[PDB]
Design a binder for this molecule. Structure first.
Ligand SMILES: Cc1cc2nc3c(=O)[nH]c(=O)nc-3n(C[C@H](O)[C@H](O)[C@H](O)COP(=O)(O)OP(=O)(O)OC[C@H]3O[C@@H](n4cnc5c(N)ncnc54)[C@H](O)[C@@H]3O)c2cc1C
Length: 450
């Protein structure tokens, strides 16, 4: 195991109790580096390993679609973890008070947690460090190359982050070792019942008092991601590089909700893809999305504290947008109109309806749905707020570094370039509705999501 995957957050007095793994971003038993790093340090200490998950108070900021998808996987994870004699403990409340009290009550020896560059995670780490006296480590279990090792600074483009991540693939793209089993605070069903009950008033309903979310598209679970990845390699991998810009076809891997919650490892997906025989043009297209653009999103959120603000934009984009702030917008809609899909664009309305109904809108339409927010907002800062709101609320893969890096590109050209100067939008890359008609059947995408 590579010691570059682990980092030291706080040196402390080594206890004699079980090494506690604070699982958060990577909710899986297989291909979890942090779970394997926590098992080896537990073996060297002749002490059992225990995992802990914190159901935070901010779960009401999302919806039932994210609460049910994440809990259903944990109901499956508790079984698999018990098959290796690893008990799981699910605390409900603030991590700063729950982790520090659990470590003290159980005489923990070492604390381990997965890596997440989001601001809400660094908020929890700041609180737990002030109330613990044992060693505290963090492990990058999400990225193939550790986020602090792929680059020591923010990469302004994909062509400059590609040769750094690819040159480090021969060292970090490796097979996973077996999760050795151990030598020897309520039911998750009750947390789902009471949690959904508090989320029913804010459930996305239609006019007929019926909900919008269709929860039969992506079944959750670690075994569920096993079948989705196998179905993509066998059926959709050969045709990926040619129909990934066509939202009328379901030609994507559909692994993003399993990737966000950590129910599947991107390293495991790359391993099976790299050994699969298919079109080299389609293989390069998928690896560039799951390796480059995915791990550069963690690069954007790690080295830019204001990743969700106007200040993280490139210097050319801030000057371009500022030079067009006072331009008369074509039309201005409110958050309630963008949320209900009540605009003058049927293609945009169809992209919002797919976001409302499935919780996973096509990748190409995500670029159109977010850029049109900037064209129909009072200011770039308002377009950022509206885009991040509708993304984090309805996307099953929402509240992920991929979203903020994808939103900062549509509204601020992050990891892009300067194009022709237009009004309102400035030099940000513009995508027209007529340009989408010559790209795919827009009429089929609209009629599909009435
Ligand atoms: C406005 C906007 C919002 C987005 N919101 C999210 C979000 O909330 N959560 C989220 O995980 N992704 C988000 N993305 C990135 C991207 O759209 C989705 O990751 C992708 O559509 C996921 O669906 P898929 O797995 O079926 O596509 P696939 O083509 O099968 O992609 C496979 C995986 O590669 C990664 N990937 C692919 N494309 C990108 C990309 N452009 N950026 C980063 N990673 C990528 C993803 O991990 C993805 O799951 C957003 C993009 C935009 C433009």
């Amino acid at each position: 195991m590579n010691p570059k995957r682990i980092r030291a957050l706080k040196s402390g007095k080594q206890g004699d109790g079980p090494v506690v793994y604070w699982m958060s971003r990577d909710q899986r038993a297989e291909d979890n580096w942090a779970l394997l790093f926590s098992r080896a340090i537990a073996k060297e200490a002749n002490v059992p390993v225990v995992v802990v998950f914190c159901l935070t108070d901010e779960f009401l900021e999302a919806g039932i679609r994210q609460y049910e998808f994440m809990l259903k996987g944990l109901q499956e994870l508790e079984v698999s973890l018990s098959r290796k004699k690893i008990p799981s403990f699910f605390l409900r409340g603030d991590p700063g008070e729950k982790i520090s009290r659990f470590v003290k009550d159980y005489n923990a020896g070492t604390l381990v947690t997965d890596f997440s560059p989001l601001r809400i995670k660094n908020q929890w780490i700041e609180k737990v460090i002030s109330g613990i006296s044992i060693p505290f480590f963090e492990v990058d279990a999400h990225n193939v190359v550790p986020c602090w090792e792929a680059s020591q600074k923010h990469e302004y483009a994909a062509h400059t982050f590609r040769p750094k991540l690819y040159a480090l693939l021969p060292e970090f793209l490796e097979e996973f070792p077996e999760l050795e089993p151990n030598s020897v605070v309520e039911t998750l069903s009750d947390v789902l019942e009471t949690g959904v009950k508090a989320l029913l008033p804010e459930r996305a309903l239609l006019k007929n008092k019926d909900p919008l979310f269709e929860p039969w598209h992506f079944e959750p679970g670690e075994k569920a991601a096993k079948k989705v990845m196998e179905s993509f390699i066998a059926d959709r991998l050969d045709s990926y590089g040619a129909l990934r810009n066509d939202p009328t076809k379901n030609m994507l891997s559909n692994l993003s909700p399993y990737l966000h919650f950590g129910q599947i490892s991107s390293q495991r997906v790359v391993l099976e893809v790299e050994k699969a025989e298919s079109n080299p043009g389609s293989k390069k297209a998928f690896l560039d999305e799951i390796l480059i653009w995915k791990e550069i999103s963690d690069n954007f959120c790690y080295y830019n504290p204001g990743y969700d603000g106007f200040e993280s934009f490139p210097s050319w984009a801030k000057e371009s947008l500022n030079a067009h702030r006072n331009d008369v917008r074509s039309h201005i809609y409110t958050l309630e109109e963008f949320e209900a899909g009540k605009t003058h664009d049927p293609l945009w309305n169809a992209s919002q309806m797919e976001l409302l109904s499935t919780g996973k809108m096509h990748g190409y339409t995500r670029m159109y749905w977010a850029k049109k927010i900037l064209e129909w907002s009072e200011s770039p800062e308002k377009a950022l707020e509206i885009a991040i709101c509708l993304n984090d609320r309805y996307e099953l893969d929402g509240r992920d570094p991929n979203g903020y890096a994808g939103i900062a590109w549509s509204i601020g050209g992050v990891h892009d370039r300067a194009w022709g100067e237009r009004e309102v939008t400035g030099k940000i890359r513009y995508m027209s509705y007529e340009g989408c008609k010559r790209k795919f059947d827009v009429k089929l995408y609209i009629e599909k999501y009435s």
